[PDB]
Amino acid sequence: QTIQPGTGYNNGYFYSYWNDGHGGVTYTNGPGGQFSVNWSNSGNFVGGKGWQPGTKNKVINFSGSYNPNGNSYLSVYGWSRNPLIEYYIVENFGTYNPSTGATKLGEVTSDGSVYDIYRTQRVNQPSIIGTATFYQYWSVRRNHRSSGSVNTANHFNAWAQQGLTLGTMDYQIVAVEGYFSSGSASITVS
């Protein structure tokens, strides 16, 4: 069902849907691991399905239609605690590469594509534990796709080799993120 921001469980999967207060986003949970997000002139939002908590060796499958009209990402996305980290394995994006301006740390090949690795820092920003400063880890896929499998271990191991360690996992989902844009997406996670 179409819902406002919140977290919970639906048909066997964790979901998290968050936004910055701006309207324009229609997030809907569907059967199994399916969710859809249609947005018209949104602000910033992040929504999708997966697991709570995630694991450091999960092989995540996703498939669907991803039609961004501007700034948007399609990522395996999640958090850890101690250390507090917000991480992304970006499988597809719209008009803006999330690593723009970030210092590249390395490359890793996984599931049919090379990925470029980066670390960024969020200062005094919202997080799963409230206002906080924390690092973000990024693997950005060079060959964009809207369906496939992601062996998270390949990315977590590659990050670890660059000194990017993860704490105790919190949630782990496939998320559609948007930033003051429009678009449509329907994704099934497993």
Q: Phi/psi at 6 (nearest 5 deg)?
A: 165, 175
Experimental method: X-ray
Of 22, 16, 8, 37, residue with least CA distance to 186: 37
**Resolution expressed in Å:** 1.0
> Residues 6 or more apart from 140 whose CB is under 8 A from it?
88, 90, 93, 97, 98, 99, 115, 116, 117, 118
Name the residue type at position 82.
N
Q: How far apart are CA 72 and CA 99, in angstroms?
A: 13
Distance from C-alpha of 18 to C-alpha of 6, rounded to nearest angstrom: 6
Cα–Cα distance measured from residue 78 to residue 75, given in angstroms and rounded to the nearest whole number: 9
Residues 30/38, Cβ–Cβ less than 8 Å: no
* Known active-site residue 107: no
Architecture of domain 2-190: Sandwich (2.60)
- Measured distance CA(15)–CA(29) in Å, rounded: 8
Report which of 68, 64, 130, 60 is spatially closest to residue 88, judged by C-alpha positions: 60
Q: Where are the beta strands (DSSP E) in 52-131?
A: 59-69, 72-81, 85-93, 104-110, 113-125
Q: Are 38 and 184 in contact (CB under 8 A)?
A: yes
How far is it, in rounded angstroms, from Cα 168 to Cα 130? 17
Query: Strands 13-19, 6-10: parallel, antiparallel or unpaired by DSSP?
Result: antiparallel
3-state class percentages of the chain: helix first, strand second, coil last, to nearest 5: 5, 65, 30
Residue from 48, 86, 90, 173 carrying the catalytic annotation: 86
Please spell the DSSP secondary structure of 115-129, one letter per residue.
EEEEEEEEEEE--BT
CB 111 within 8 A of CB 148: yes
CA distances from 187 to 19, 63, 73, 124 (A): 18, 6, 13, 31
DSSP 3-state of 13: strand
Strand 85-93 to strand 132-141: parallel, antiparallel, or no bridges (unpaired)?
parallel
**At CB < 8 A and 24+ separation, what contacts does 118-122 make?**
119/162, 119/164, 122/86
What tokens appear for 29 in the block?
């949970």
Question: Catalytic annotation on 86?
Answer: yes
Name 92's Cβ contacts closer than 8 Å, sequence gap at least 6.
66, 68, 73, 74, 141, 144, 145, 146
Say which of 33, 140, 177, 179 is annotated catalytic: 177
Q: Are 121 and 136 in contact (CB under 8 A)?
A: yes
